[PDB]
């Protein structure tokens, strides 16, 4: 059949009973905020911020908090952070390219000949449509985080739980230490795009649409991947239609329209309206509502750096950046999902990513020897045409110049630390995540002699309409430990170093579990600020404090996701003087892909990460510095 999974428990079985996202006590939030400030602020800055915190907790903050709580109790179908967080993304006027959109790259099909571009484009496309089908049918297994997978990820439990009504089903999983996740974001995975508009962009979805969008050399093509009955178009036909597209000899347009999706959101909002005025509404409608955008790149990957630039931004011509996601397949079969971040988070895209990799490699629709269906692709595949006025041509030329100049300034490079990873660190009773984050802190001290604002993404999808919370890895413990390794390495015995590292690990694990439970401080303080602005009030002084602005100017911006399906991932710095650090600690090695602009040096940082990781492993192995 056209399904890649056959869950007996409906996909959405736990959604109705998901716990609401907790609002912390204000007292806990201000304490956590100041705790994160401790490594960043000098004595007088800290005392000044401590004083604003007290004012806030006693004054306008207490009143904003009372109102946050009452609003939440009137909207128990949702989360307090959901509206504010969507608004954070959609009101942002900066380019979504680099600023917001990340990538994750698939590992190759382990069967060598399946990495042929046509074979893999077809297999990955068909598997993505099978994911859409399985989601529609409620046949995708619910997302569930198991503490004891051997007790709860069992047919035995699944047979039982399916009889528990959705109003109670979450409780049945909770009682076996399983935690069902929110899955409401999957409503925007397919047939969805972001539409640029003044003030605040729009999330658009059209579930009726049955066609794929393909970009090749900056030309736009659409064809159906679902027939009128609701079945997947025969994969041999899809193969034919893709072969047709791959055969187009037309040069890259003089005015590649995909450049516009990289503009400032107000600029693009106005140019899109001009596109409509010039009669393009039908064309844009087909782009907007396609199942997703398949991007066929006309070159192989030179190396990991090239791959990373290719999947993060490409050259500006062959990605529709607004789309829920772009599935990119290069000439050597290298594939990635580049996604728009406003509609959903890492956990939702990763499940799609994992199922698509598993299906496309284990149950490929076609083989490198399949004969495309005898079909008249020119009748089935429409080549889209945009009517561009002079103002549109000029806007595309400007979009291109701005794209080219900015991307020019972006560097990305990687390390593969091979001495060990998760196995060895867990043996030493440490959180691998904490160790990576320590290494980043220690690296930055070694390189710049500073402790700086640090961001780690944490899913709050254990709750109804959850998104993310910020883990704040820069702690007094990481700062002390880094100082010991970097500044006075002869002052401490290996036992002392190992203990310092143990205290980093514990506090990091504590922050991680708090964040996952909604007990960070970042989202809470953000929702209070949002509430004050939405009520038409002056910004409270807490938020005007340089230290608050510093806490949210994330020089070290980090994110990890791990899966056997992901070769690597990337994102650009979130600030001009920042790094963007995609990392994974695997069973036996550690990988970091780091981006930077002109204001930072990613190569040096990575040399420092390498050195710090060597120093950390040496101390852990008993060896002296
Ligand atoms: C909690 O750990 C995990 C649990 C389940 C999985 Cl499938 C993967 C992981 S993980 O290996 O990818 N991982 C290691 C520790 C960790 C932590 C502390 C946080 C996250 C996480 O939430 N990451 C994340 C990344 C990006 C986003 C995003 O939306 O951008 C959101 C969350 C993953 C991981
Ligand atoms: C939504 C966030 C996505 C970005 C996070 C992806 C992190 C996993 C990959 C780490 C890059 C490691 C590079 C080593 C080279 C292989």
Strand partners, 593: 414, 582
H helix and E strand count, the chain: 22, 18
**Is 543 annotated among the ligand-binding residues?**
no
Residues with CB under 6 A from ligand 1: 345-347, 433, 457-459, 468, 512, 559-562
CA of 612 to the centre of ligand 2 (A): 19
Method: X-ray
381 close to 222: Cβ distance less than 8 angstroms: yes
Q: Where are the alpha helices (DSSP H) in 138-234?
A: 149-152, 155-161, 169-174
**Is 428 annotated among the ligand-binding residues?**
yes
Q: At 357, is the secondary structure helix, strand, or coil?
A: helix
307 close to 70: Cβ distance less than 8 angstroms: no
CB atoms within 10 A of CB 412: 22
Nearest to 521 by CA among 185, 18, 19, 56: 56
437 close to 445: Cβ distance less than 8 angstroms: no
Which residues are CB-contacts of 90 (< 8 A; sequence separation ≥ 6)?
A: 194, 200, 201, 202, 203, 342
Best mutation site among 349, 458, 586 for ligand 1, i.e. most ligand atoms within 8 A of its Cβ? 458
CB atoms within 10 A of CB 183: 21
The tokens describing 297, both together, are 């790149």
For 100-141+181-410+564-573, which CATH superfamily applies?
Answer: Choline/Carnitine o-acyltransferase, domain 2 (3.30.559.70)
- Phi first, then psi, for residue 11 (nearest 5°) are -50, -45
**Is 420 annotated among the ligand-binding residues?**
no
The tokens describing 224, both together, are 């159906």
Which residue has the CA at smallest separation from atom 11 of ligand 1? 562
CA of 346 to the centre of ligand 1 (A): 7
Which residue has the CA at smallest separation from atom 13 of ligand 1? 561
C-alpha span between 259 and 396 (Å, rounded): 6
Element (H, E) at 411: strand 411-417
**Is 402 annotated among the ligand-binding residues?**
no
CA of 250 to the centre of ligand 2 (A): 35
Asked if 20-99+411-563+574-625 and 100-141+181-410+564-573 have one fold, the answer is yes
- Using CA atoms of 27, 21, 190, 557 in order, give the dihedral in degrees to the nearest 10: 30
**Burial group, residue 624, by CB count within 10 angstroms (0-12, 13-18, 19+):** exposed
The tokens describing 507, both together, are 């506090």
C-alpha span between 68 and 119 (Å, rounded): 52
215 close to 292: Cβ distance less than 8 angstroms: no
Nearest to 456 by CA among 439, 448, 465, 445: 439
Q: DSSP class of residue 490? A: T
Which residue has the CA at smallest separation from atom 16 of ligand 2? 568
CA of 342 to the centre of ligand 1 (A): 18
Closest approach atom of ligand 1 to CA 344: 29
Catalytic residue, chosen from 146, 341, 492, 607, is: 341
Q: Is 421 in the pocket of ligand 2 (CB under 6 A)?
A: no
Closest approach atom of ligand 1 to CA 516: 22
Using left for φ > 0, alpha for ψ between -120 and 50, and beta otherwise, residue 216 falls in: beta
C-alpha span between 207 and 76 (Å, rounded): 27
- Which ligand is nearest the CA of 347, by number? 1
**Is 125 annotated among the ligand-binding residues?**
no
Which residue has the CA at smallest separation from atom 6 of ligand 2? 569
Q: Is 139 in the pocket of ligand 2 (CB under 6 A)?
A: no
Nearest to 101 by CA among 275, 283, 232, 265: 265
**Is 548 annotated among the ligand-binding residues?**
no
CA of 583 to the centre of ligand 2 (A): 5
Q: Which fold is adopted by the domain 20-99+411-563+574-625? A: Chloramphenicol Acetyltransferase (3.30.559)
Q: Where are the alpha helices (DSSP H) in 416-493?
A: 422-427, 432-448, 476-486
Q: At 70, is the secondary structure helix, strand, or coil?
A: helix
CB atoms within 10 A of CB 50: 16
- Checking 359-362 for CB contacts under 8 A at 24+ apart, the result is 359/4, 359/127, 359/130, 359/131, 360/109, 360/120, 360/123, 360/124, 360/126, 360/127, 361/109, 361/110, 361/111, 361/114, 361/123
Q: Would you kindly state where each structural domain of the chain is located, as residue ranges?
A: 10-19+142-180, 20-99+411-563+574-625, 100-141+181-410+564-573
CB atoms within 10 A of CB 53: 21
CA of 308 to the centre of ligand 2 (A): 10
**Is 254 annotated among the ligand-binding residues?**
no
Assess whether 77 carries a catalytic annotation: no
Best mutation site among 89, 457, 591 for ligand 2, i.e. most ligand atoms within 8 A of its Cβ? 591
Which residues are CB-contacts of 342 (< 8 A; sequence separation ≥ 6)?
A: 86, 89, 90, 96, 100, 194, 201, 203
C-alpha span between 184 and 188 (Å, rounded): 8
Closest approach atom of ligand 1 to CA 459: 22
- Which ligand is nearest the CA of 561, by number? 1
Q: How far separated are the first and last CA of the chain, in Å rounded?
A: 59
CB atoms within 10 A of CB 541: 14
Which residue has the CA at smallest separation from atom 4 of ligand 2? 569
CATH architecture of 10-19+142-180: Up-down Bundle (1.20)
Nearest to 608 by CA among 542, 540, 556, 551: 556
Strand partners, 590: 417, 585
127 close to 356: Cβ distance less than 8 angstroms: yes
CA of 530 to the centre of ligand 1 (A): 26
Which residue has the CA at smallest separation from atom 26 of ligand 1? 346
């Amino acid at each position: 059949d056209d399904y890649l999974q056959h869950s007996i428990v409906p996909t959405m079985h736990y959604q109705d009973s998901l716990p609401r996202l907790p609002i912390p006590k204000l007292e806990d939030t201000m304490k956590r905020y100041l705790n994160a400030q401790k490594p960043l602020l000098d004595d007088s800055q800290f005392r000044r911020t401590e004083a604003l915190c007290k004012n806030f907790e006693t004054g306008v903050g207490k009143e904003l908090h009372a109102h946050l709580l009452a609003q939440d109790k009137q909207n128990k179908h949702t989360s307090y952070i959901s509206g504010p967080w969507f608004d954070m993304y959609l009101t942002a006027r900066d380019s979504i390219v680099l600023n917001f959109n990340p990538f994750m790259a698939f590992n190759p099909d382990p069967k060598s000949e399946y990495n042929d571009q046509l074979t893999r484009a077809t297999n990955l496309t068909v598997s993505a449509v099978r994911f859409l089908k399985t989601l529609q049918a409620g046949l995708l297994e619910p997302e569930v985080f198991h503490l004891n997978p051997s007790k709860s990820d069992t047919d035995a439990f699944k047979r039982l739980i399916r009889f528990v009504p959705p109003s109670l089903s979450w409780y049945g999983a909770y009682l076996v230490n399983a935690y069902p996740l929110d899955m409401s974001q999957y409503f925007r995975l397919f047939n969805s795009t972001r539409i640029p508009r003044p003030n605040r962009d729009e999330l658009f979805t059209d579930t009726k649409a049955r066609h794929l969008l393909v970009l090749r050399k900056g030309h736009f093509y659409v064809f159906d991947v679902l027939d009128q009955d609701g079945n997947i178009v025969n994969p041999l036909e899809i193969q034919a239609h893709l072969k047709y597209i791959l055969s187009d000899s037309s040069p890259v347009p003089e005015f590649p329209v995909a450049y516009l999706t990289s503009e400032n959101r107000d600029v693009w909002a106005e140019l899109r309206q001009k596109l409509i005025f010039d009669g393009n509404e039908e064309t844009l409608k087909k782009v907007d509502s396609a199942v997703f955008c398949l991007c066929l790149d006309d070159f192989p990957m030179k190396d990991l750096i090239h791959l990373s630039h290719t999947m993060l931004h490409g050259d500006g011509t062959n990605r529709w950046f607004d789309k829920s996601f772009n599935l990119i397949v290069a000439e050597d079969g290298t594939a990635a999902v580049h996604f728009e971040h406003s509609w959903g988070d890492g956990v939702a895209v990763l499940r799609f990513f994992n199922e698509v990799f598993r299906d496309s490699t284990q149950t490929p629709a076609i083989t490198p020897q399949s004969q495309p269906a005898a079909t008249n692709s020119s009748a089935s595949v429409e080549t889209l045409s945009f009517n561009l006025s002079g103002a549109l041509k000029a806007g595309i030329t400007a979009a291109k110049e701005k794209f080219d100049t900015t991307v020019k300034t972006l560097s990305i490079d990687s390390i593969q630390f091979q001495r060990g990873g998760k196995e060895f660190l867990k043996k030493k009773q440490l959180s691998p995540d904490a160790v990576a984050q320590l290494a980043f802190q220690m690296a930055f001290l070694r390189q710049y002699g500073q402790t700086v604002a640090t961001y780690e993404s944490c899913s709050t999808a254990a709750f109804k309409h959850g998104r993310t919370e910020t883990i704040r890895p820069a702690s007094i413990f990481t700062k002390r430990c880094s100082e010991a390794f970097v500044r006075d390495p002869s002052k401490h015995s290996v036992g002392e170093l190992q203990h310092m590292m143990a205290e980093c690990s514990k506090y990091h694990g504590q922050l991680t579990k708090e964040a996952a439970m909604g007990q960070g401080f970042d989202r809470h303080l953000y929702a209070l600020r949002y509430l004050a602005t939405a009520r038409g009030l002056n910004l409270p002084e807490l938020y005007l404090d340089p230290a608050y602005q510093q806490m949210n100017h994330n020089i070290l911006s980090t994110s990890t996701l791990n899966s056997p399906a992901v070769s690597l991932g990337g994102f650009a710095p979130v600030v001009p003087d920042g790094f963007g650090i995609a990392y994974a600690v695997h069973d036996d090695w550690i990988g970091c892909n780091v981006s930077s602009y002109s204001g930072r040096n990613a190569r040096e940082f990575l040399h420092c990460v390498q050195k710090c990781l060597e120093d950390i492993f040496d101390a852990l192995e008993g060896k002296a510095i």
